[PDB]
């Protein structure tokens, strides 16, 4: 169970103002604050994935001092998240799988294909169940499992337009991996939205893992079966999503009467800032 191509690709764009996560549970009301943590640059010349898609990569994603991720779509186009150093049953590998039932977390020592996947159709059964297990399938000598409610909006996202954009912050402090995400309601429908947003903190796992080469995976509709459809027919383009890299610089933050962030500026920018 592994169908692969040896072809990768990459794209290119320019972010403007994204990646604002709440660093602590403080209720600062209508005041200002200074923030010195891992953030995206303002007007950052970020790295894109290709706007095409269905396509299929096997990319290498470099973890560099916290990783910000963004994807606006319907029907949950992206589903898996593999973080770690080598991901070949020799370093600690953090696995996130988001189905429609309940998201599952595996901080385990798992070998991997260079592009693990699972193919789903109905095929006169009305069941897009997990029939392919092209992930590890072995090396279960590990010490973590977790089950949570799906924060991600599920498959078949019938909404008015490009209604929601998923921002994600994968951050590590002393082996403590924290996911600070936001399913924000965007309504601009043109690539990167020109606007302001904030990210709530929701996932904190103090487990212990070294992450150098991470990846982001998915589970979509290829064949549901190995011989019913021809393989190696999906081009190296992946999907349209944005990746950005954080850094520990100075920034300024402003709060409102409801305690949320309404404005923020990059203190390490052009000198008016």
């Amino acid at each position: 169970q592994c169908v692969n191509l040896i072809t990768r690709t990459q794209s290119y764009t320019n972010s403007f103002t994204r990646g604002v996560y709440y660093p602590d549970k403080v209720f600062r009301s209508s005041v200002l604050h200074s923030t010195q943590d891992l953030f995206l640059p303002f007007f950052s010349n970020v790295t894109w994935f290709h706007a095409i898609h269905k396509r299929f990569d096997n990319p290498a994603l470099p973890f560099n001092d916290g990783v910000y991720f963004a994807s606006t779509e319907k029907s949950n186009i992206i589903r898996g998240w593999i973080f770690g150093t080598t991901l070949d049953s020799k370093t600690q590998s953090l696995l996130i799988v988001n189905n429609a039932t309940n998201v599952v977390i595996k901080v385990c020592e798992f070998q991997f294909c260079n592009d693990p996947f699972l193919d789903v159709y109905q095929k006169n059964n009305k069941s897009w169940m997990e029939s392919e297990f092209r992930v590890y399938s072995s090396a279960n000598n590990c010490t973590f499992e977790y089950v949570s409610q799906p924060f991600l909006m599920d498959l078949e996202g019938k909404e008015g337009n490009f209604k929601n954009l998923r921002e994600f912050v994968f951050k590590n402090i002393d082996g403590y991996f924290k996911i600070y995400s936001k399913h924000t309601p965007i309504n601009l429908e043109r690539d990167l939205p020109q606007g302001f947003s904030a990210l709530e903190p929701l996932v904190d796992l103090p487990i212990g893992i070294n992450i150098t080469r991470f990846q982001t995976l998915l589970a979509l509709h290829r064949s549901y079966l190995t011989p019913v459809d021809s393989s190696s027919g999906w081009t190296a383009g992946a999907a349209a999503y944005y990746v950005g890299y954080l850094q520990p610089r100075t920034f300024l933050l402003k709060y409102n009467e409801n305690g949320t962030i309404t404005d923020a500026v990059d203190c390490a920018l052009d000198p008016l800032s």
Partner: protein
């Protein structure tokens, strides 16, 4: 007292100063979550013989309410060195997370753990965090630690080139290859292998005794908890000068109903003045504020 402040047995006229009122807290109210599950520490302390210094089985015990009595049942507790904390306050407060790394070292390097002096652990073999909030306990169970036949499985690495980042497990090859000749690992006398054994048979001296050294690594100022004794969240008071305890941080003040609204995950309510004046119970939604006494 006015005659006292004027340093004379008479006073002239008018207004003079003295001390303040300083209203005292009448009681103390502690707020804890309503989860109390007992924890089996017999699977982490008095288990079988543990590893040597060349491997650190960094085992994190899960979230479980455990009193100090279970840990205190062990008579042969021998290590007493700490750093800024007396070893008699291990309970009544809920810590962050326990890293009870339990392994064995040779008995003549117990006094060389501290930084500022390089030993068999403070060398390139291991790098320890500079703060070291966690402590070290090392009891002896030599009645079953050392078999009569012998225990030669304990190893340690001695020679290394580079420097390690602290709080890492140091398990690798780390071989030596140098000299003014081609060696390529099979030279012979140019090997100088850095891994050496210990050996443990019960006819030894004083620095050759095995120890079940558990180093306890933790931190401070972290909102949830992993292991602490069963202590109850006592009943609250309103408009009472009280020492409130919000899972850790305490203070003196009175309670007021909070008209303002907070986010469900933003229960902490610090202000521009950098004071805690908003809180909710760890069990119930209690949108409240605190004004100090």
């Amino acid at each position: 007292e006015t005659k006292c402040t004027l340093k004379s047995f008479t006073v002239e006229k008018g207004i003079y100063q003295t001390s303040n009122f300083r209203v005292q807290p009448t009681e103390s109210i502690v707020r804890f979550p309503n989860i109390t599950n007992l924890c089996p520490f017999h699977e982490v302390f008095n288990a079988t013989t543990f590893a040597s210094v060349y491997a650190w089985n960094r085992k994190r015990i899960s979230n479980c309410v455990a009193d100090y009595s279970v840990i205190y049942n062990f008579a042969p507790f021998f290590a007493f060195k700490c750093y800024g904390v007396s070893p008699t306050k291990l309970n009544d407060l809920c810590f962050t997370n326990v890293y009870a790394d339990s392994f064995v070292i040779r008995g003549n390097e117990v006094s060389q753990i501290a930084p500022g002096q390089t030993g068999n652990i403070a060398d390139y073999n291991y790098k320890l965090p500079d703060d070291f909030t966690g402590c070290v306990i090392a009891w002896n169970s030599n009645k079953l630690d050392s078999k009569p036949s012998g225990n030669y499985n304990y190893l340690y690495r001695f020679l290394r080139k580079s420097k390690l980042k602290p709080f890492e497990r140091d398990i690798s090859t780390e071989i030596y290859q140098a000299g003014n000749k081609p060696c390529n690992g099979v030279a012979g006398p140019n090997c100088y292998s850095p891994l050496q054994s210990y050996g443990f048979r019960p006819t030894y001296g004083v620095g050759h005794q095995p120890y079940r050294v558990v180093v306890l690594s933790f931190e401070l100022l972290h909102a949830p908890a992993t292991v602490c004794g069963p202590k109850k969240s006592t009943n609250l008071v309103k408009n009472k000068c009280v020492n409130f305890n919000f899972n850790g941080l305490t203070g003196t003040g009175v309670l007021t109903e909070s008209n303002k609204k907070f986010l469900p995950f933003q229960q902490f309510g610090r202000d521009i003045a950098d004071t805690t004046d908003a809180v909710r119970d760890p069990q119930t939604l209690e949108i409240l504020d605190i004004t100090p006494c």
